[PDB]
Design a protein around this ligand. Structure first.
Ligand SMILES: *C(=O)c1ccc(-c2ccc(C(=O)OCC)cn2)nc1
Ligand SMILES: *NNC(=O)c1ccc(-c2ccc(C(N)=O)cn2)nc1
Ligand SMILES: Cc1cccc(C)c1
Ligand SMILES: Cc1cccc(C)c1
Ligand SMILES: Cc1cccc(C)c1
Ligand SMILES: Cc1cccc(C)c1
Ligand SMILES: Cc1cccc(C)c1
Length: 9
């Protein structure tokens, strides 16, 4: 889940 968001950065 964290990675799914972190792609934004
Ligand atoms: C949420 O974005 C997210 C994405 C990917 C993963 C995840 C956990 C573990 C592996 C892995 O290769 O584990 C080897 C033990 C890959 N991806 N978790 C949360
Ligand atoms: N928000 N994330 C990024 O902007 C981001 C872009 C690219 C990469 C990345 C990581 C690792 C490789 C590699 N070839 O091992 C390439 N690009 N990370 C984050
Ligand atoms: C951070 C990241 C790695 C692999 C695939 C996705 C969608 C995101
Ligand atoms: C982010 C990442 C690196 C290496 C291997 C996996 C499955 C995921
Ligand atoms: C915004 C964010 C949360 C967790 C992990 C990373 C790399 C970024
Ligand atoms: C407020 C906000 C928007 C997009 C992405 C993040 C990590 C935060
Ligand atoms: C270019 C940029 C916008 C927002 C957040 C970061 C870390 C960089």
């Amino acid at each position: 889940l964290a990675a799914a968001l972190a792609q934004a950065l």
